[PDB]
């Protein structure tokens, strides 16, 4: 229960259906792990943010802070999201049933373009995650 099965943020992840990213239907109480594993020893540099539908579609980024600053190739980077309406923590994310939340990255994937604010990996590999909190799948 609750533990939702980690979601490796890495182009090789088949779950990122190219052109439509990966869609999820997490419910309240559900826990989720976005992971950026190490290396083996080619590492994909990313700066993962959570954004509104606007920025989600037509991949652009803007005070818009990374949940994952995948830039440490020797160790694992990870953000465990807790799908709760009311957060026991003040600096902790909160959700609401029947709302969508989007997580994208506009990085080239390479260290070179880790700060790209436009398109990037998202636009290409379609590394976006749409979470339809408390909703089924048509």
């Amino acid at each position: 229960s609750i533990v939702l099965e980690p979601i490796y943020w890495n182009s090789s992840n088949s779950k990122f259906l190219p052109g439509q990213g990966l869609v999820l239907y997490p419910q309240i109480g559900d826990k989720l792990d976005i992971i950026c594993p190490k290396v083996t020893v080619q590492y994909e540099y990313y700066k993962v943010y959570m954004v509104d539908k606007d920025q989600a579609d037509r991949c652009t980024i803007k005070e818009n802070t990374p949940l994952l600053n995948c830039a440490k190739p020797d160790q694992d980077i990870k953000f465990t999201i807790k799908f709760q309406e009311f957060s026991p923590n003040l600096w902790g994310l909160e959700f609401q049933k029947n709302k969508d939340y989007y997580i994208i990255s506009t990085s080239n994937g390479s260290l070179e373009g880790l700060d790209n604010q436009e398109g990037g990996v998202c636009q290409t590999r379609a590394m976006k995650i749409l979470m339809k909190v408390g909703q089924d799948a048509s």
Partner: protein, 171 residues
């Protein structure tokens, strides 16, 4: 100044502290530091449920050859009835001395350090102003004699979140 023996913020990786029950009570969730930095935290808020007794004991903490050890906790606690009267605004902090750094179960075994409380809580999310409603409680553990120890946290029905756990000994 202060020799740290543990800081939940700088231990990297996953915290993975054992908790009883493994889930439903204390859960290890992430957050964006007040100063943005991504940290790992622990929390529970089963305020609407009866008979709460959620435990979370850290991992083996060496006393590095020190007697008195200080414990620095940084919790938040959301104002209970800001959710859909009587409100638990405290929790208990325990400890257990041990030369064994692989204890895998371990309550009566534990010793209560004190009933700790929140000087401040909140109602809305992080919207309220900005923030530093972040309580920070300091506690001392009696004279030690063994190699290390474990820190236990006991929830009893308060909407609390542990942002940081730091321990040191002052040389």
């Amino acid at each position: 100044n202060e020799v740290t023996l543990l800081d939940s913020r700088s231990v990297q990786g996953e915290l993975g502290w054992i908790a009883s029950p493994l889930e439903g009570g204390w859960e290890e969730v992430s957050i964006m530091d007040e100063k943005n930095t991504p940290i790992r935290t622990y929390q529970v808020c089963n305020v609407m449920e009866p008979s709460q007794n959620n435990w979370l004991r850290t991992d083996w903490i060496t006393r590095e050859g020190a007697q008195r050890v200080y414990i620095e906790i940084k919790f938040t606690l959301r104002d209970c009835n800001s959710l859909p009267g009587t409100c638990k605004e405290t929790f208990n902090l325990y400890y257990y001395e041990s030369d064994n750094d692989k204890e895998r179960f371990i309550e009566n075994q534990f010793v209560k350090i004190d009933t700790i409380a929140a000087d401040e809580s909140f109602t809305q999310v992080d919207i309220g102003d900005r923030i530093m409603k972040l309580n920070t409680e300091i506690r001392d553990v009696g004279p030690l004699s063994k190699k290390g120890f474990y820190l236990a946290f006991q929830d009893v029905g308060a909407c609390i979140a542990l942002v940081s756990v730091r321990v040191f000994y002052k040389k």
